[PDB]
Amino acid sequence: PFQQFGRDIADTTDAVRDPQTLEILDITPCSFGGVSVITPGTNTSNQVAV
Amino acid sequence: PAYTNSFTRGVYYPDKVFRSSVLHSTQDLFLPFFSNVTWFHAIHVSGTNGTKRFDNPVLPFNDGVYFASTEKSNIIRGWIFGTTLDSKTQSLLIVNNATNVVIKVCEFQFCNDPFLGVYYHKNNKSWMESEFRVYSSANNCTFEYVSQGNFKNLREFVFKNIDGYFKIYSKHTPINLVRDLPQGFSALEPLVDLPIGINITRFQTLLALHAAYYVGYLQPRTFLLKYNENGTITDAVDCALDPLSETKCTLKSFTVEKGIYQTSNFRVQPTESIVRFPNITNLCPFGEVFNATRFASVYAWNRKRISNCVADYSVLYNSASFSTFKCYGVSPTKLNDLCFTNVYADSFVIRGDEVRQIAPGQTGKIADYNYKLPDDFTGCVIAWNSNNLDSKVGGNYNYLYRLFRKSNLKPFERDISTEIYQAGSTPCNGVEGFNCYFPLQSYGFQPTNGVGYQPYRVVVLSFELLHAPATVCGPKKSTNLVKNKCVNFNFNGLTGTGVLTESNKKFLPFQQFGRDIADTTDAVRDPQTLEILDITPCSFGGVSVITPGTNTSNQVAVLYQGVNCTEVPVAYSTGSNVFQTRAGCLIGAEHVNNSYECDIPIGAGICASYQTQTNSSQSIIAYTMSLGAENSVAYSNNSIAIPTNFTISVTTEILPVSMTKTSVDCTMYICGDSTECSNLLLQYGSFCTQLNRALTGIAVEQDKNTQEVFAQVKQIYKTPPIKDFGGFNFSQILPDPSKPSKRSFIEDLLFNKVTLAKFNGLTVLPPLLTDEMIAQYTSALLAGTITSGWTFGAGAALQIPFAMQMAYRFNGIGVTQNVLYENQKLIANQFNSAIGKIQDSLSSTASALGKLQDVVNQNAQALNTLVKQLSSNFGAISSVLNDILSRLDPPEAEVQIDRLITGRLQSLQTYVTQQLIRAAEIRASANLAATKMSECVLGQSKRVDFCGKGYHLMSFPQSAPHGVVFLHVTYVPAQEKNFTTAPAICHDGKAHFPREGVFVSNGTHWFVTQRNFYEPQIITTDNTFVSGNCDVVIGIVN
C-alpha cells in the first residue's frame, strides 16, 4: 500500500500503478531495437531480406 | 540524570518513491544511530505517592526528531510544532490515537506548558467528571485537516522538514517484548505531507504541573537502505557514523566482505591562514606629512605621488584624529587589503561647509573652479579641523580659491595660471568693474569662527583604477608564525597549504618568490624578514578503511595514507591505540612486532588484519607486510631438491571473452523520439555516426573472437552420450543428457551467479552464440580436447585416444607418459575431487569467480552510468531532455538544448572512450583466450606458467555470461628430496647427461631423472649420453 511509483535494480521504471485503481503492471520496451538488411550481393539479384 | 541511548530506530521512507529488491545509499535527513538520547520521566503522580520533579521531555527540532515512547494509555495529545511558539508562528497541532488525527495550526501563548491534572476516579478516555483542559490559544487557523498491558504496541513517530512542507510518519508496531530496546528495525511511512511553509525548531509534549522513553535528534547523514524481496525497509546503515558505515556505503551492501576501501581523504583544515607583509609601512607618506608648516590652497592642492609602498590606514582611524574616515564608492573598511593603481598625497585646507562640496555629486564654487572629482566616483575624505594646530591670531586668509572660469576643472586639474579672464565684452584694459573683476578671492577665516569656518587639516587619497600598475597596497597583520603544523599562508599573492619550516637554502636580493623542479610553490621568503622557508601541502594522503567482512562484527578501523599523526579523535577490545608507521597515522590497529602473512596491504608495507591472539583476543592487528614468513632453504653449489609427489589442481583463472554487446541508437539514446533533439544530433552527424561505427566494430570484433576461440573449426562436434572412462570422467563439466540444455552443473552454478545483473537505448545485441548454442560450441571444444585433442587445429576433428591425449599434454611440460600410465586412476579421482572443490568454492566463496564476476560488475556498472548521467543534468531537471525543450520557448529551448546536447555529446564520447578501452583490454584478453584454447587446449604450450597459476597440464572451456572458464589443470610439485647434485658426473673423466637430466643421487646410488618429478634412474649410456669435458667444470663430482 505504501507504493505510488516504481523502479528496478538498474534504476529503470519497473512498474507503474494506476492511481485510480490498484492492479499489477509492467513496462517492457516495445521493439528491443533491431533494423538490419540481410541481402546478398547487389551484383546478384534484388530479392531483399530484412 | 539518566542518558540511555536509542536503538537503530528513527528512520522514515526517503521520499515519495518505491523501488524493490534493491539497495540505495540515498541522501536524506536521518537520525544518527546509537546516539545518546533521553529517558524522560514526566509521568503522573499517584493517589498516595509517586512524586518526582517530573520536568518536561523537551528537545528542540534539531533537523528532525525521533519519538519512541511506549505508553500504555496515551494521555499525551499535544504535538506542538511551531517555528518559535512566541505568538508569531502557526504551530501545527497533532493529536494521535489508533490511526486517525485532527489537525489545526493555531498559535500558542499558553502558561508554563499546556498542562492538566491527573488524579483519582478518572482518566481512561472519558470523564463523567470533566477536567482535562484543552484550549489555550486562538489567533488563526491557517490550515486544518480531519480524518495484560505488557507493551501491547508502540506509537513511534519521526518528524522531518524539507522546503517547508512537513511529513508526519506513524507506524504502530506491535512490540510485546518487555525486555529492553528491541534490537531490530522497522521504518515509518508518511500519512499526510502538507506545506505549512514555516520552519520547525521545537516540539513539546502535553504534561501536567502545579518505563522506557526515548527522544533523539537528526543530522544530515545518509544511510544505506536495504529493501527485502517483498520490498520494505528491514535494515539500514549510515555512511559517516563509523568506518563500516562508509564501508557499506561505498560498497552498497549489507554483507560487505573484508578489504581496504577508498572512502574519502581527511582534508585536514589549516589551523590559521598566515597573512604577512613587509616589515614596516616602507615609507608611507602619512606618519611624516600631517605635521607641516602650512598647507596649500584648493586651486593649488598639493600632489605627492604614492607608490612602491604600503599604507596602514586603520592605525590612523584608531588615532581618532579624523573628522571623517568614510569613503565614497569604495568603503573605508576593505580599503586596507584592496589596492588601486595610482595614489597621491594631497594636503590642503577646506571649509566645513565645503566639506560637502568635496563629495561625489556635490556642487559649489570650489566644485566648479577649484577642485572636481571625476564622475568615476572612487574617493574618500580624510581630515580634521585646525583650531588647535593651525590657529593664528588675527586669522589666516592665505588659503585662496579660484572664482572665475568658463567651465569646470578637468579631472585632477590643478590650476595656478593667471590667464586673462574676461566674461564680459569690453577689453577691461584697466577699466575694471561691472563685467570686469579680478578672478581671485581669499577665505578670510578667524580662529573664532565656527568649526566649519575654522581651518582644517585635510589629506585626501586618490584611488584611480588606471591601466598602470597598482603599487600602493595593504597593511600588516603578521606575527602569524607557524612551525611544523598544517596551516595556510599568504605572502601577498603566492600561497601554499601546510607548514612553514626553516629550510636549507640561501636567497638573493632581487628575488622574492620561489619555485621548484615541477614548477610549483616550494619556498617563500618573508617580506618582513630574511628566513629560508619551506611549504608542503598539509596532509592529503588518503583514507582507506581496513576491516574484516561485515559477517564479522563492527570493530571498526581507519587509516591515514602515509601521513604524520596530526588528528587523533581516538575515543577492552579498543583503547588508546595510536600507531603511526610507514603507512602513516594508522589507527584502530595495535602494532605487532611480528608479521604473519599479509591479506590486505594498506600502504607502504602494512597489512591490518583481524586474527585472534592469546594473552590471558579478537581485534585488528597490523604489521609490516610480508609473504607467509621468511623462508631459508640452503642453496649450495651441489644441492638440489626433487618432488617425489605432486598435485593435479584445477586452478580456475578465468578470462573475459566478450562484453554485453551493446549498441547505441545514438539519436534515440540522446533523443528518445524527440524532434529537435533528433534534428540537432543528426546535424552534428559525424559524431554519433562514428560512435555507432566503433561500437559495431566492437560487436563484430568480439564475436569473431568468440568464433575463433570457440568455432576454431566451424564444424560442430557433439559429445557421444556414451560417457565411459572408468574414472577419468567429466560428469559436472561434460554435457548432461538429462538436462534441458546440454550444459552441466558448473554452467548452472555460473548462471545462477548472474545475480550481478533495456529501456534507455541499452540495445542489447544478442550474442551470435546464445546460452544454448554458445554451450553447443563450448561442448564441442571440450569434445575436441577430450577426443580429437590438439589435431583439432586444422578443421579436422581427428579423434585421439584420451588416455594418450593427456599423455601428450603432460609431454607438453616435459612429462613422460610414465607418471600418467602409473597414476591415472588416482589422477582422475583427485581431478574429480578438485572439480568438486571448485563447485563448492564457487557455491561458497564468490571471490573464486572474483575477477570475471567483477568485470561483469563494471560492465553492468558502466551501463548504469550510461543511464545515470541523464541524471547528471548539467543545469536541467529531467532525465530525457525533451521535456526541458518543451519547458522553454523554442528559440530559448534551442539555446538551452544546445548546451544540454553538448554535455550529452560529452557523455557519449566519455562512455565510448571507456567502452573502447575496455574493448582494447578485453581484446588483448580475447587473443589471450584464443592462445589458451590453441597453445593450451588445442595442444599444450611448452610456454610455462601462464595457463593459470603454476604449470599447465590441461585446460577446459565452459560457458559463462559474456565470459568463459578455463579449467587450468596445473602441475605443482609436492615433495622435496634435497640430496646432493652436480652439473654432471666425470664417471669417464668427462661430463655426462641425457637430452636433459639432473644427476641427483641418494648416496646409496647415483640417480638421474627429469626436472619436475622424482622418477630416478641410474646413469646409463642409453639415456644419459656423454659430452663435454671434465677440465674446468664447477661443482662436479669426480
Ligand SMILES: *[C@@H]1O[C@H](CO)[C@@H](O[C@@H]2O[C@H](CO)[C@@H](O[C@@H]3O[C@H](CO[C@H]4O[C@H](CO)[C@@H](O)[C@H](O)[C@@H]4O)[C@@H](O)[C@H](O[C@H]4O[C@H](CO)[C@@H](O)[C@H](O)[C@@H]4O)[C@@H]3O)[C@H](O)[C@H]2NC(C)=O)[C@H](O)[C@H]1NC(C)=O
Ligand atoms: C623591522 O624594523 C624594526 C625597526 O625598529 C626592527 O626593530 C628592531 O630590530 C632589531 C633587529 O631586527 C632589534 O634588535 C634586537 O636585538 C635583540 C638582542 O638583544 C641584545 O642586543 C640589544 C641591542 O640593543 C641589547 O640592547 C640587548 O640588551 C641584548 O644585548 C634580539 O633579541 C631581538 O630579536 C627580536 O626581534 C627579531 C626581529 O628583529 C625577532 O626575529 C626575534 O624573535 C626577537 O623577537 C632583536 O634582534 C631591535 O631591538 C628592534 N627595535 C625596535 C624598536 O623594534 C625589526 O626587528 C624589523 N623586523 C625584523 C624581522 O627584523
Ligand SMILES: *[C@@H]1O[C@H](CO)[C@@H](O[C@@H]2O[C@H](CO)[C@@H](O[C@@H]3O[C@H](CO[C@H]4O[C@H](CO)[C@@H](O)[C@H](O)[C@@H]4O)[C@@H](O)[C@H](O[C@H]4O[C@H](CO)[C@@H](O)[C@H](O)[C@@H]4O)[C@@H]3O)[C@H](O)[C@H]2NC(C)=O)[C@H](O)[C@H]1NC(C)=O
Ligand atoms: C601424493 O599425494 C597424494 C595426496 O596429496 C597421495 O594420495 C594419498 O594416497 C594414499 C595411498 O595409500 C592414500 O592412503 C590410503 O591408505 C589406505 C590404507 O588402507 C590400507 O591399510 C588399512 C590399515 O591401515 C587396511 O585396513 C586397508 O584395507 C588397506 O590395506 C588405503 O586403504 C586408501 O585406499 C582408499 O581407497 C580404498 C578403496 O576401497 C578405500 O577402501 C579406503 O578407505 C581409502 O579411501 C588409501 O590408499 C591417501 O588417502 C591419499 N590421500 C588422500 C588425501 O586421500 C598420494 O598417495 C601421494 N603419492 C605418493 C607416492 O606418496
Ligand SMILES: *[C@@H]1O[C@H](CO)[C@@H](O[C@@H]2O[C@H](CO)[C@@H](O[C@@H]3O[C@H](CO[C@H]4O[C@H](CO)[C@@H](O)[C@H](O)[C@@H]4O)[C@@H](O)[C@H](O)[C@@H]3O)[C@H](O)[C@H]2NC(C)=O)[C@H](O)[C@H]1NC(C)=O
Ligand atoms: C508480503 O507480505 C505479506 C504479508 O506479510 C505476505 O502474505 C502472506 O500470505 C500468506 C498466504 O495465504 C498468509 O498465510 C497465513 O494466513 C493464515 C490465515 O489462515 C486462515 O486463512 C487462510 C486463508 O488465507 C485459510 O486457508 C486458513 O484455513 C485460515 O482460514 C494465518 O493463520 C497464518 O498464520 C498465515 O498468516 C500470511 O499471513 C501472509 N503473511 C503473513 C503471515 O503476514 C506475502 O506473501 C508477502 N510476499 C512475499 C513473502 O514475498
Ligand SMILES: *[C@@H]1O[C@H](CO)[C@@H](O[C@@H]2O[C@H](CO)[C@@H](O)[C@H](O)[C@H]2NC(C)=O)[C@H](O)[C@H]1NC(C)=O
Ligand atoms: C482519536 O482522535 C480523533 C480525533 O481527536 C477522534 O475522532 C473524533 O472523535 C470525536 C470525539 O472525541 C468524535 O465526536 C468525532 O466524530 C471523531 N471523528 C472526527 C472528528 O472526524 C477519535 O474518536 C479518537 N479515537 C480514539 C479511540 O480515541
Ligand SMILES: *[C@@H]1O[C@H](CO)[C@@H](O[C@@H]2O[C@H](CO)[C@@H](O)[C@H](O)[C@H]2NC(C)=O)[C@H](O)[C@H]1NC(C)=O
Ligand atoms: C477507566 O478507569 C476507571 C477508573 O478511573 C475505571 O473504573 C473502574 O471500573 C471497574 C469496573 O469494571 C471497577 O472495578 C474499578 O474499581 C473502577 N476504578 C476506579 C473506581 O478507580 C474504568 O472502568 C476504566 N475504563 C476503561 C475503558 O478502561
Ligand SMILES: *[C@@H]1O[C@H](CO)[C@@H](O[C@@H]2O[C@H](CO)[C@@H](O)[C@H](O)[C@H]2NC(C)=O)[C@H](O)[C@H]1NC(C)=O
Ligand atoms: C563419473 O564416475 C563417477 C564414479 O564412477 C560417477 O559418480 C556417480 O555420481 C552420481 C551422481 O548423482 C551418484 O548418484 C552415484 O552414486 C555415483 N557413483 C556411481 C554411479 O557409481 C559419475 O556419475 C560419473 N559421471 C559420468 C558422466 O559418467
Ligand SMILES: *[C@@H]1O[C@H](CO)[C@@H](O[C@@H]2O[C@H](CO)[C@@H](O)[C@H](O)[C@H]2NC(C)=O)[C@H](O)[C@H]1NC(C)=O
Ligand atoms: C661450494 O660450496 C662448498 C660449501 O658451500 C665449498 O666447500 C667449502 O666451503 C667452505 C665454506 O663455504 C670453505 O671454507 C671451504 O674451503 C670449501 N672447500 C673447498 C674444497 O672449496 C666449495 O668450495 C664451493 N665450491 C665448489 C666448486 O664446490
Ligand SMILES: *[C@@H]1O[C@H](CO[C@@H]2O[C@@H](C)[C@@H](O)[C@@H](O)[C@@H]2O)[C@@H](O)[C@H](O)[C@H]1NC(C)=O
Ligand atoms: C557478379 O559475380 C559473378 C560471379 O562472382 C561470384 O559471385 C560474387 C558475388 C563473388 O562471391 C565472387 O567471388 C564469385 O565468384 C561475376 O561473374 C560477375 O562478373 C559479377 N558482376 C559484377 C561484379 O558486376
Ligand SMILES: *[C@@H]1O[C@H](CO)[C@@H](O)[C@H](O)[C@H]1NC(C)=O
Ligand atoms: C550521552 O552520554 C555521554 C556520557 O556522559 C556524553 O558524553 C554524551 O554527550 C551524551 N550525549 C548527549 C548529551 O547528547
Ligand SMILES: *[C@@H]1O[C@H](CO)[C@@H](O)[C@H](O)[C@H]1NC(C)=O
Ligand atoms: C514518596 O516518593 C518520593 C519519591 O520522589 C520519596 O522521595 C519519598 O520518600 C516517598 N515518601 C515516603 C513517605 O517515603
Ligand SMILES: *[C@@H]1O[C@H](CO)[C@@H](O)[C@H](O)[C@H]1NC(C)=O
Ligand atoms: C526558515 O526561515 C527562513 C527565513 O529567512 C525561510 O526563508 C526558510 O524558507 C524557512 N525554512 C523552512 C523549511 O520553512
Ligand SMILES: *[C@@H]1O[C@H](CO)[C@@H](O)[C@H](O)[C@H]1NC(C)=O
Ligand atoms: C565471515 O566469512 C568468512 C569467509 O570465509 C569466514 O572465513 C569467516 O569465519 C566469517 N566470519 C563470521 C563472523 O561470520
Ligand SMILES: *[C@@H]1O[C@H](CO)[C@@H](O)[C@H](O)[C@H]1NC(C)=O
Ligand atoms: C609529518 O611530520 C613529520 C614529523 O612530525 C615529518 O618528518 C614529515 O615530513 C611530515 N610529513 C610530511 C608529508 O612532510
Ligand SMILES: *[C@@H]1O[C@H](CO)[C@@H](O)[C@H](O)[C@H]1NC(C)=O
Ligand atoms: C617490537 O615489539 C614492541 C613491543 O610492542 C613494539 O613496540 C615494536 O614496535 C616492535 N617492533 C617492530 C619492528 O614491530
Ligand SMILES: *[C@@H]1O[C@H](CO)[C@@H](O)[C@H](O)[C@H]1NC(C)=O
Ligand atoms: C636438506 O636440508 C637440510 C637443511 O634444512 C639439511 O640439514 C639436510 O642434510 C638436507 N638433506 C640432505 C639429504 O642433505
Ligand SMILES: *[C@@H]1O[C@H](CO)[C@@H](O)[C@H](O)[C@H]1NC(C)=O
Ligand atoms: C634412499 O635409499 C633408501 C634405501 O634404499 C630408500 O629406502 C629411500 O627411499 C631412498 N630415498 C630416496 C629419496 O631415493
